[PDB]
Amino acid sequence: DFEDYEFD
Amino acid sequence: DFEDYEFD
Amino acid sequence: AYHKDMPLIFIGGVPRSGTTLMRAMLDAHPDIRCGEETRVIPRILALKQMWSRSSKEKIRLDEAGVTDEVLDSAMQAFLLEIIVKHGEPAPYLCNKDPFALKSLTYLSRLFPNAKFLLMVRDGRASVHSMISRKVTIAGFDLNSYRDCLTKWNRAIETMYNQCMEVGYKKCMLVHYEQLVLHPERWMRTLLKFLQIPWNHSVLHHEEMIGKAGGVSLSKVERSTDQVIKPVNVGALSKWVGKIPPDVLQDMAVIAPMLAKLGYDPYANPPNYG
Amino acid sequence: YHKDMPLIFIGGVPRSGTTLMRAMLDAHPDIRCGEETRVIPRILALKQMWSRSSKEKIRLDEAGVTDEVLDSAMQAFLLEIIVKHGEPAPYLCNKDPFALKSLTYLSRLFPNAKFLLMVRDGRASVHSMISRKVTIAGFDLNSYRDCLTKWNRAIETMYNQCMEVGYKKCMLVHYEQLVLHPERWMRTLLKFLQIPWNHSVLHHEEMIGKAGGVSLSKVERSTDQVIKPVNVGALSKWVGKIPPDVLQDMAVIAPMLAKLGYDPYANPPNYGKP
Ligand SMILES: Nc1ncnc2c1ncn2[C@@H]1O[C@H](COP(=O)(O)O)[C@@H](OP(=O)(O)O)[C@H]1O
Ligand SMILES: Nc1ncnc2c1ncn2[C@@H]1O[C@H](COP(=O)(O)O)[C@@H](OP(=O)(O)O)[C@H]1O
Ligand SMILES: [Mg+2]
Ligand SMILES: [Mg+2]
Ligand SMILES: [Zn+2]
């Protein structure tokens, strides 16, 4: 469920 | 954009 | 002085279950401070829970050196800053954020001398309260008694199971209806559980609103205008007649936690007395 | 450890030489960065949301959860992660690319923190994430157009904050310039950090897995590149890969290219031309 990174 | 509480 | 081994009190439950009353009755005690809902505590607990529940993510964190030990230390540090610094000092610090008890067992790990008070109220009452007053909860559809009872059921099942997991030396279930019908009985039992001396002021919390060593209220919390009143029986069964008959029909199936917690799902209302 | 300790934060858009940067610093005997924490940018993002809402800030203030309280909690959480997730060293460092979306905030929490913003040609960063399938929430990896638009947004925010805090607190490091002139840039960078030179930063590959050296995560996406010596093989792999509509619209899609010294109509720029 988590990606390599998150851009919010 | 926040509710009183969050369930999760 | 503060540290992760200090004796903390965490109050919670599903919103609209007498959690503000409970914390206000404790705030009326000269040696306890709870204060207002922090809001941020359940949010950071939820974030953490999502990390540690993904097997893939836990592996990535472990390989980064962000182990349970590291995370737990960081969480202890964050949570203590919030609990300690957001309110007045007292010998016994307390936190009330209803959904913090979705992480009850985890908190009991982080804070080994913490005790927990799980407020339990008839789900029909809690649901009618949130719907009628429009108290918003992410994940609850206030247009549906059925959805709200379903979600109430899931939420209290998690919190109840964790209360039972840590056991009677760490968690006490407090039934809202019992508390308002018998507050001396229940407050004496509860203060014995917490190992804090009796004080009669907990039965007259209305007299301690806005006073030093007393009850600090937020003007934007949804329960403030109720908690300024003395401990009363006016909210026992406002729900009766307000729930759609199709939801009444299916009550035991929608909300099996009612029967588990001693509330008759066919009684409109149960004789709480 | 305390909130006045010297700290180094590295970031930028992913696929911009951030892992190389932190590895070159990790090769210094007195600096430890370590692996990406993953959790730091998440807690920063949460905290920012509470600040992007007047209604919520009012609720928090009326609960006693003021900026002073939140800042103390944030400092405590962040220091525990930074300090405890890796080996001790005189100069601690954190690299999580998007932590620098909260650059100005971190600078306020940590007055002795300095920042290194990695900048790489957005066309190179985008081709890297798409070709390697490095996932970023909010980026559509089936669209060069979307990824360049989101790259542009992300680096604009981070760049503006870097400049806002100023040259004594944040240094822009161009990836292409670093790999083309490693000693030149490492000398400048270590002087900016006020850390004495160590030659080991120029042979970081020799410090992989060594005490006081470079610890690499087997599940990080840049690991198999950073095991190699500093090299110029990744400057222009993007050339010819971008669809022609996106090439035509490049200056409009990604105005930060020109602002950061990259000619949006050169395929590629001659990065080393003085
Ligand atoms: N002084 C008091 N006596 C009895 N119940 C009280 C009270 N103060 C608050 N409560 C009850 O607590 C409920 C809210 O719980 P919480 O604080 O957990 O959201 C409200 O139910 P109603 O909305 O049905 O009136 C409210 O009436
Ligand atoms: N030793 C090295 N020399 C040159 N570039 C390197 C390197 N190690 C890593 N990089 C580059 O850093 C980029 C990834 O940056 P980040 O760590 O910020 O995600 C990769 O680009 P490519 O994917 O285009 O090869 C990679 O080649
Ligand atoms: Mg008190
Ligand atoms: Mg080192
Ligand atoms: Zn009274």
Numbering used by the authors:
A (entry chain D), B (entry chain E): 1002 to 1009
C (entry chain B): 64 to 336
D (entry chain A): 65 to 338
Q: What does the literature reporting this entry say, word for word?
A:
The asymmetric unit of human TPST1-PAP-C4P5Y5 contains two human TPST1 molecules, which assemble to form a dimer. In the human TPST1-PAP-C4P5Y5 complex, eight residues (D−4, F−3, E−2, D−1, Y°, E+1, F+2, D+3) out of the eleven residues of C4P5Y5 were defined in the electron density map, suggesting that human TPST1 binds strongly to C4P5Y5. The human TPST1 recognizes C4P5Y5 in a manner similar to that of human TPST2. Furthermore, the positions of the catalytic residues R79, E100, K159 and S286 in human TPST1 are almost identical to those of the catalytic residues R78, E99, K158 and S285 in human TPST2, suggesting that the catalytic mechanism of human TPST1 is basically same to that of human TPST2. F−3 in C4P5Y5 interacts with W114 of human TPST1 through a hydrophobic interaction. The calculated interaction energies of residues furthest from the −1 and 0 positions were high.
Tyrosylprotein sulfotransferases (TPSTs) are enzymes that catalyse the transfer of a sulfonate moiety from 3′-phosphoadenosine-5′-phosphosulfate (PAPS) to the hydroxyl group of a tyrosine residue to form a tyrosine O-sulfate ester and 3′-phosphoadenosine-5′-phosphate (PAP). TPSTs are integral membrane glycoproteins located in the trans-Golgi network. In humans, two TPST isoforms, termed TPST1 and TPST2, have been identified.
